[PDB]
Amino acid sequence: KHNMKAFLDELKAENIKKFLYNFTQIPHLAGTEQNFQLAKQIQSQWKEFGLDSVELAHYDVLLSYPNKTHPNYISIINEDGNEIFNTSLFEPPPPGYENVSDIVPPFSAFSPQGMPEGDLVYVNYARTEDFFKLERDMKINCSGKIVIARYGKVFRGNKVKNAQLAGAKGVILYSDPADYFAPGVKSYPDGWNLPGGGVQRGNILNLNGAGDPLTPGYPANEYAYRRGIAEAVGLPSIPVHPIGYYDAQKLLEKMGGSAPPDSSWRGSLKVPYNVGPGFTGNFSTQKVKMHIHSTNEVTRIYNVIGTLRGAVEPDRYVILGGHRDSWVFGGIDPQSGAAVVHEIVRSFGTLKKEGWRPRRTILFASWDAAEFGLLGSTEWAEENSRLLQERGVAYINADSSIEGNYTLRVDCTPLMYSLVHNLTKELKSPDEGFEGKSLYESWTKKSPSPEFSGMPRISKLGSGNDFEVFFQRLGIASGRARYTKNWETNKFSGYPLYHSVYETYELVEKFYDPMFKYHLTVAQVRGGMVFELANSIVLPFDCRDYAVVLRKYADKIYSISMKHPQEMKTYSVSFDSLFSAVKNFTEIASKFSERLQDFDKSNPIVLRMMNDQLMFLERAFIDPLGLPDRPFYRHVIYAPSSHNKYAGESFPGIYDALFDIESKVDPSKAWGEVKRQIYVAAFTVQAAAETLSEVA
Amino acid sequence: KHNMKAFLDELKAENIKKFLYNFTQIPHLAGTEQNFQLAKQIQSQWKEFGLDSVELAHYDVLLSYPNKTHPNYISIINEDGNEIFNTSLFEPPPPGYENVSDIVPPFSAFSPQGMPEGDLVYVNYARTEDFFKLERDMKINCSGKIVIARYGKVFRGNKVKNAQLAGAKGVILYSDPADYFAPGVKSYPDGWNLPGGGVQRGNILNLNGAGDPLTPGYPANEYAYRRGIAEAVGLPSIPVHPIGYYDAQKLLEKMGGSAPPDSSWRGSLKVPYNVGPGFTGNFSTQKVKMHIHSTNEVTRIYNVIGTLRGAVEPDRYVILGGHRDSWVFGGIDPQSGAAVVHEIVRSFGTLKKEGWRPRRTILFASWDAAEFGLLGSTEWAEENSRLLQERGVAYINADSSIEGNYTLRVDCTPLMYSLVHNLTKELKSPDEGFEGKSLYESWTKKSPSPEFSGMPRISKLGSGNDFEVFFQRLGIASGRARYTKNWETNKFSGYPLYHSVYETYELVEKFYDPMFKYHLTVAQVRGGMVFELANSIVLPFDCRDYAVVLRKYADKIYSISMKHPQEMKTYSVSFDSLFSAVKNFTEIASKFSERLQDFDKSNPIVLRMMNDQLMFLERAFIDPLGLPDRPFYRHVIYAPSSHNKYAGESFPGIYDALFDIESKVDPSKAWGEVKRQIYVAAFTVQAAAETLSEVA
């Protein structure tokens, strides 16, 4: 039989290992020749694997690169203007890679040029709340100051934005061992920890879903009209550079001024973590000087797009997509993902050569320039928006397959909760001590749901990865899955070697997944999801799961508002309409579920009607007017958090209207806008519900 | 057989006559009790006629009414502040209607209150070009002046906007006999001409498709959050009032200052038509004073929505919709339309009682408050936008069935050209001297196409009627048809009695269509279109007709640009991408047409795929970012003209970027924006084309 089991059994750990090794020997930075060559290889292999068509889709987008003959660096500079300390020009390359060319040195992509000079201020993680504490409680003024912040907690772009709005003239980012050095584990190459010379690369854009900064709304094709750099979306306005903790210790050790307000402002370096401004009396005459010469350049990028045509519904698209571009070798990010996608394509292709086709069309994507703002996925979605919104069933992301080896992590739309539970009950756990048990069992034991005993945690989709255009702009049901760490035992952030030169094949092979069993499990989850989405006769979405979470989110947003009872009285702020809409959604979803079970399974138009209602349900949560000042974030239920692009926020329109509302100067206007957002949310929920009513 | 012929034959002239009489005995102004009662009657009858469900959909929208105890009027006022002449408080009621209550006196709906006083300036039709001539060529300054303009040429809202931007403090609108008095025809009640006391009512909003001024984007439902009046969409900022030509003669006869620049500024009144400002020396001390006390009030409105469920594709909607609200009796506008809709419902209902159902679902609509800004249709579309955009096949409008008795007039999407040609070849001509000939023949002879011999004129859809939200916001294929006058023999504007108290049943019965044969023909065209749209196995859209017009429109826009050859050289302005997109659309449409003819007619999913490609083709011309500063006008090919809401403009984004470009202060920026609009248009055409490519 050609069934999901045949698909799953053909997937091999050893193939994934082989592909990972193949993908990680040289750097594959977006816009470079090496990443074009890898795109061509992938295209060629996907054809060999049996896909019906495989094309490159290219775009000319704004990228950012250091200047090869004028390196970026930071100095301590004395009263005489002598540079007494310089940060590193590159990370010490790992063993055996010391002769690899084109390792891009650490830099913050899209930094403007500058040589700003001034006094340091230490801003902890540069979060909204960290700045509120500096300005409001400690009375410290960042205007004209070079701010130094530790990576972590939130997306680095949010940090640079928060810094800019506080008036800083420069940002230095660093990795504190408190956040990137797991206790008792060796530094690379002898374990998986960040060494003192390791540095986290990364873009510092605030695109809010726009894609290429120069062409918001429209693909960056050959005839594209581009904004001028001055009108570009999302570029930082002050220079920024990342450093490791050895270099950071040299810049922090002399800090004077105010003490840290508490232990949550202190990392693990042997320094006071004084906020500043400036250095201590002996050194109060010294200052910090940045030297940033990176340039922004319109550069060609290449997505690989593979098609496996559906036998029955070729006009319905299930997309499996992940990025190919890396900062350096991409051992985890993204090649642990891409290797999995490669094997999934190979397995579907095997079935296809034996005469099988999925019911629906499967699209496979190798996205470019994700590291520079999700540009490849976004540009392609902008080009094909009409096709995607009328034909897009679901999107399954495929970035890094592992960030740990403890248990499964799933983030998805509530429409896929049931699919995920049912699939994981049929997969084997790869975990130690769960031999012969299901993935569902090991996952549920290690990551229990905070609400329901006997079920696992599934998180909301936020952003910061290539599902973003599909889910938050277009309203296509989306999900992602990977192996992760134990967040209880490990307070540290992401994984220590994230976006560093030390993210290699050897890192993975030696320290994360020697048997490639966690990779195989992830291939089975991602692959299995795609298989069911593309082959199940009735789409495997349970609208009733949406009803459940909508009530939870309405309860939560109401709780936030109810911190201001006097204002709710004064401005007649009622959540009644939102609760009524959620109630109606629950009732109508329940009736729809009955019809979907009891409908005449013989009739294909009836089947197609009800599959269309399921497909367009996620779509119904899109507001074509977007969110305030964020036209590309259109999902009324989910939007990336305005304080941390990484995290999901629910009813973001109402949440943002309530945020820090007690500080607004005109409370009548601010509570008016809360009421407006309540109306918009209620209406949207009711409108979504009504898509599931009988059609006529 | 239950076929289109059975449907057509059941339609009766005498029924339409009976319904017209029934609908026009009393006023049915939006928001009044009489129009609620008529909505209830229509609902009850549509149920009796056999529709599966008939509901009222209500909204609370901003309307506008004169103050019953403080009438609006205009004065000539002397140096002493004595009112020496007053305009009329009402139109002399027509014979036998002199005791009808609740005839709303003439007024300009949504005028603010005021009593401005000042010197008259005469602005001809208050068009863009008329103001360009006043300011640029004649050096006349309208700032602080009360402007008097004649109705005609363009939508009256555009006039008041043009006036406001010229700095006027008030607008007086009037009907000049040059534009509303056909030579040799008697005034009502002895013929169909406008008498001197007749007055054209009408709203003066500039909504740009927004609907209810207080709730743009979202239905004005029970829990709606409303803008404050200060932030409302589209309200005029200076007082405005309409008058008849007797009253206008009294205000114009004393005009001094500059002579009219030419005979195109002179109407037919026995006055000089001097531009002003002010009156002649004897009377230079007198001024004009307006007295406007109308109030804007949130008021409930009611649409009637009838459903005839499809037997095979109940989730596909063909909509027949027209308004019910009138300024007074609505003898032509809208009841000549609504009576036709009533009979069409009755005829579909007859078939339904004998066991027939259309293939697709038919929705019938009686819209409210069209006269106040298309509010009923727009609010309902806003509420149901998700359903309409995923399920909406087509919209057929049904306002006034007749504005003349000379020949047919059709305005529609190119997707319906073939449908209209084929239907009209099967209908009988009702025209004198064309007995036994087809409607196509009489129509083609009387209104020849300007491009193709042997075909009739079909015009573009613009706006100013209830198709607007469906076509220009949502991108649902739309059309309209009515009987019209001979535009060669009749230079006058619309029909003389438009929006006056004299628009009665008797007007129609005596002077337009005594046998109700033109009404019957219009019922057959509108009804026949609906029938084919709802019953044809393959949707009756020819994508190749779109290709043809897209080339014509690209040629036209290029011609406009080529008035500025030096600038096209200097700024490298190329139309190559747009022509390439149009070429590709033509080729891909041609291939699609072959597939649609040659496809396996046995397979229902293949049939549904290709019908979806046809349905979503109009949809593909929607830009979710809208047009600049007009978010509710989203159709890239068609948008109401920025100088005349009534007329269609093609490639409006590029047209508006080129308009008066030689006056822009920064040519580099202005030509940049032209290039941006070319990119957007090219991309959109190509994207639309690609919806017709093979799906995988």
Ligand SMILES: *[C@@H]1O[C@H](CO)[C@@H](O[C@@H]2O[C@H](CO)[C@@H](O[C@@H]3O[C@H](CO)[C@@H](O)[C@H](O[C@H]4O[C@H](CO)[C@@H](O)[C@H](O)[C@@H]4O)[C@@H]3O)[C@H](O)[C@H]2NC(C)=O)[C@H](O)[C@H]1NC(C)=O
């Ligand atoms: C969830 O679904 C339910 C349907 O089960 C839906 O109920 C609807 O709620 C509205 C209230 O928001 C009801 O509106 C009424 O409609 C009648 C005519 O049918 C009117 O007479 C009512 O207006 C009078 O009373 C008002 C309130 O005091 C006054 O403000 C007003 O001026 C009038 O005097 C009122 O408009 C509606 O009938 C029900 N529908 C049904 C079928 O019960 C509810 O709205 C849904 N929730 C959401 C968020 O959509």
Ligand SMILES: *[C@@H]1O[C@H](CO)[C@@H](O[C@@H]2O[C@H](CO)[C@@H](O[C@@H]3O[C@H](CO)[C@@H](O)[C@H](O[C@H]4O[C@H](CO)[C@@H](O)[C@H](O)[C@@H]4O)[C@@H]3O)[C@H](O)[C@H]2NC(C)=O)[C@H](O)[C@H]1NC(C)=O
């Ligand atoms: C209408 O349909 C046709 C397809 O039949 C479509 O043609 C495409 O046009 C573009 C040009 O806009 C071609 O783009 C090229 O793609 C190749 C790779 O496939 C590149 O090497 C080319 O780039 C080089 O040359 C450029 C031009 O001098 C340089 O600017 C560039 O830096 C490179 O050196 C170029 O990108 C494309 O191949 C064709 N596609 C096909 C299948 O022929 C046309 O674009 C469609 N019209 C619209 C408006 O979409």
Ligand SMILES: *[C@@H]1O[C@H](CO)[C@@H](O[C@@H]2O[C@H](CO)[C@@H](O[C@@H]3O[C@H](CO)[C@@H](O)[C@H](O)[C@@H]3O)[C@H](O)[C@H]2NC(C)=O)[C@H](O)[C@H]1NC(C)=O
């Ligand atoms: C995930 O797995 C669960 C458990 O199997 C699925 O739910 C089950 O779905 C089936 C098929 O629709 C339901 O069976 C039907 O039930 C009624 C009688 O109760 C009747 O129409 C038929 O006799 C038929 O057997 C079954 O009740 C239902 N079970 C539960 C506990 O809900 C679920 O659908 C799967 N999810 C996905 C996305 O596939």
Ligand SMILES: *[C@@H]1O[C@H](CO)[C@@H](O[C@@H]2O[C@H](CO)[C@@H](O[C@@H]3O[C@H](CO)[C@@H](O)[C@H](O)[C@@H]3O)[C@H](O)[C@H]2NC(C)=O)[C@H](O)[C@H]1NC(C)=O
């Ligand atoms: C309006 O009427 C015209 C004229 O009848 C319709 O065009 C005709 O459509 C038919 C049916 O698709 C075409 O017939 C087919 O043609 C090919 C061979 O040439 C073959 O597949 C079959 O043998 C079949 O007969 C016919 O050629 C075509 N005629 C013309 C002149 O185009 C048109 O489709 C109608 N429009 C609408 C919207 O219904």
Ligand SMILES: *[C@@H]1O[C@H](CO)[C@@H](O[C@@H]2O[C@H](CO)[C@@H](O)[C@H](O)[C@H]2NC(C)=O)[C@H](O)[C@H]1NC(C)=O
């Ligand atoms: C990654 O694997 C690919 C595919 O096996 C290798 O590419 C092949 O390289 C050989 C030269 O050794 C050529 O004969 C083939 O034409 C290549 N095939 C394709 C599809 O590109 C590639 O060399 C491997 N890369 C590394 C670093 O091991």
Ligand SMILES: *[C@@H]1O[C@H](CO)[C@@H](O[C@@H]2O[C@H](CO)[C@@H](O)[C@H](O)[C@H]2NC(C)=O)[C@H](O)[C@H]1NC(C)=O
């Ligand atoms: C930090 O790097 C700078 C730049 O290379 C060094 O400064 C240069 O040193 C030479 C002489 O040693 C001067 O002639 C250049 O003009 C200097 N350039 C600048 C911009 O100052 C500096 O020595 C380095 N400092 C340390 C401690 O390594």
Ligand SMILES: *[C@@H]1O[C@H](CO)[C@@H](O[C@@H]2O[C@H](CO)[C@@H](O)[C@H](O)[C@H]2NC(C)=O)[C@H](O)[C@H]1NC(C)=O
């Ligand atoms: C328009 O026609 C309707 C329907 O025939 C008339 O309404 C009926 O009026 C009688 C009273 O004479 C009642 O018994 C019915 O209940 C009414 N029916 C409905 C459906 O409303 C209406 O009176 C006619 N109006 C005019 C002005 O002639």
Ligand SMILES: *[C@@H]1O[C@H](CO)[C@@H](O[C@@H]2O[C@H](CO)[C@@H](O)[C@H](O)[C@H]2NC(C)=O)[C@H](O)[C@H]1NC(C)=O
């Ligand atoms: C135009 O109408 C106004 C308002 O009714 C008339 O003016 C009023 O006339 C009486 C005496 O005749 C005064 O006591 C009122 O105070 C006047 N009101 C105002 C606002 O002036 C006026 O007579 C009318 N003019 C004509 C020519 O009919």
Ligand SMILES: O=C(O)CC[C@H](NC(=O)C(O)(CC(=O)O)CC(=O)O)C(=O)O
């Ligand atoms: O530009 C963006 O929005 C994100 C690009 C890129 N994103 C990633 O690397 C991520 O894997 C995105 C993700 O997994 O959600 C970062 C993370 O989760 O810590 C970045 O954060 O630098």
Ligand SMILES: O=C(O)CC[C@H](NC(=O)C(O)(CC(=O)O)CC(=O)O)C(=O)O
């Ligand atoms: O508010 C609007 O946009 C138009 C409402 C209303 N429209 C009409 O009366 C029309 O019939 C609209 C139409 O037929 O396109 C006016 C006309 O064509 O002369 C009006 O013009 O006053």
Ligand SMILES: *[C@@H]1O[C@H](CO)[C@@H](O)[C@H](O)[C@H]1NC(C)=O
């Ligand atoms: C690199 O830096 C030098 C010095 O400013 C400059 O002349 C050169 O053009 C730079 N290269 C780029 C690509 O900007």
Ligand SMILES: *[C@@H]1O[C@H](CO)[C@@H](O)[C@H](O)[C@H]1NC(C)=O
């Ligand atoms: C912070 O410092 C600068 C002085 O250089 C001043 O201009 C700025 O307004 C200050 N901000 C506050 C909030 O005090």
Ligand SMILES: *[C@@H]1O[C@H](CO)[C@@H](O)[C@H](O)[C@H]1NC(C)=O
């Ligand atoms: C891999 O698994 C075991 C967990 O007990 C451990 O040796 C190691 O810390 C894990 N690796 C990582 C990178 O978490």
Ligand SMILES: *[C@@H]1O[C@H](CO)[C@@H](O)[C@H](O)[C@H]1NC(C)=O
């Ligand atoms: C009508 O006019 C009078 C005089 O200004 C005013 O007192 C009354 O309230 C008005 N009515 C309305 C509905 O505004």
Ligand SMILES: *[C@@H]1O[C@H](CO)[C@@H](O)[C@H](O)[C@H]1NC(C)=O
């Ligand atoms: C027109 O007249 C007024 C004088 O009342 C003046 O303020 C305004 O600027 C003038 N406009 C032009 C264009 O001259």
Ligand SMILES: *[C@@H]1O[C@H](CO)[C@@H](O)[C@H](O)[C@H]1NC(C)=O
């Ligand atoms: C109706 O038809 C004939 C056309 O010859 C004529 O008597 C009359 O002018 C027409 N009516 C109108 C209103 O155009």
